[PDB]
Symmetry: C2
Subunit: 86 residues, 2 copies
């Protein structure tokens, strides 16, 4: 059943997912960075460029998840103020 508590739980799932996603992109960025100076510059340019594209996608993703979490919490508060009318 949808309750304010359930909406808040799902909001937490979205917020936690955004954090995991940011951590993941941070770890992978470190790997690409570590290759700098370890092979040809043109090869590094390719992987840095592709990584930056992945980073742009993840920036978009995180922003959307954070918005969903915020909006779910807003609706949960509305539910908490609508529920149990008497």
């Amino acid at each position: 059943k949808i309750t304010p508590e359930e909406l808040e739980r799902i909001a937490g799932n979205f917020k936690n997912a955004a954090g995991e996603a940011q951590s993941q992109i941070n770890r992978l960025e470190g790997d690409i960075n570590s290759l700098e100076g370890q092979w040809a510059g043109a090869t590094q340019a390719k992987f840095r460029g592709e990584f930056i594209q992945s980073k742009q996608a993840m920036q978009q993703y995180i922003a959307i998840l954070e918005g969903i979490s915020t909006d779910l919490k807003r609706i949960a508060d509305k539910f908490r103020n609508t529920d149990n009318a008497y």
Copy 2:
């Protein structure tokens, strides 16, 4: 591989990093699936206009994730191809 001055990275190191990208792609797919299940669990349990708002935003996130996953898998594949290339020289 070894002889060329600017090739310093070993094939095994490239394969290690490739594994990180492959694993990240898998984790990312599992994540978007869990979150989709969450939005799905709300279907029909609140107003259609409310569900429509969240479904639309979620689908935007889902497309961003699809793009990301595709890029990560390409990076993993390419790193392994280059590791093979260096291992042969």
